[PDB]
Design an enzyme around this catalytic site. Structure first.
Site: not given
Ligand SMILES: CN(C)Cc1c[nH]c2c(CCCO)cccc12
Length: 121
Positions: A27, A29, A31, A47-48, A51, A64, A89
């Site tokens: 998860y 990334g 994920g 966290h996902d 959101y 923010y 976050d």
């Molecule tokens: C262009 N770019 C780098 C987008 C990006 C970087 N890190 C991310 C995470 C990390 C969240 C997971 O904890 C989640 C979703 C999108 C991104």
């Protein structure tokens, strides 16, 4: 936005969001499937989901403001989407700090096909 989330993570854990938490487990990334591999991955799952409770907000680009009261993360007053994104976050950052001791490098760049099973928010 990712700009704030990234800074928050670095401040909390001493690790850089990319690549410590951008390709971790199932998860952290891109994920979006399977069973979280460990506690840190569970932080990303929650966290996902957080959101997910905000369909008309844009957490990746919406910025923010937040301040530090001696340790404590304090989200500053902004639009309602900004306030809720920040809380999501903040929670993740604390969860990461709380589970730093079990963070395993064997879960970085984790393969997709091994993210199996299912979990509803
Ligand atoms: C262009 N770019 C780098 C987008 C990006 C970087 N890190 C991310 C995470 C990390 C969240 C997971 O904890 C989640 C979703 C999108 C991104």
């Amino acid at each position: 936005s990712l700009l704030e989330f990234g800074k928050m993570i670095l401040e909390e854990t001493g690790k850089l969001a990319i690549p410590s938490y951008s390709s971790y487990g199932c998860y952290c990334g891109w994920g979006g499937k399977g069973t979280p591999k460990d506690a840190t991955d569970r932080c990303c799952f929650v966290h996902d989901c957080c959101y997910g409770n905000l369909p008309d907000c844009n957490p990746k680009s919406d910025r923010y403001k937040y301040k530090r009261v001696n340790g404590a993360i304090v989200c500053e007053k902004g639009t309602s989407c900004e306030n809720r994104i920040c809380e999501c976050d903040k929670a993740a950052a604390i969860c990461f700090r709380q589970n730093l001791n079990t963070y395993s490098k064997k879960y970085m760049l984790y393969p997709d096909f091994l993210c199996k099973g299912e979990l509803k928010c």
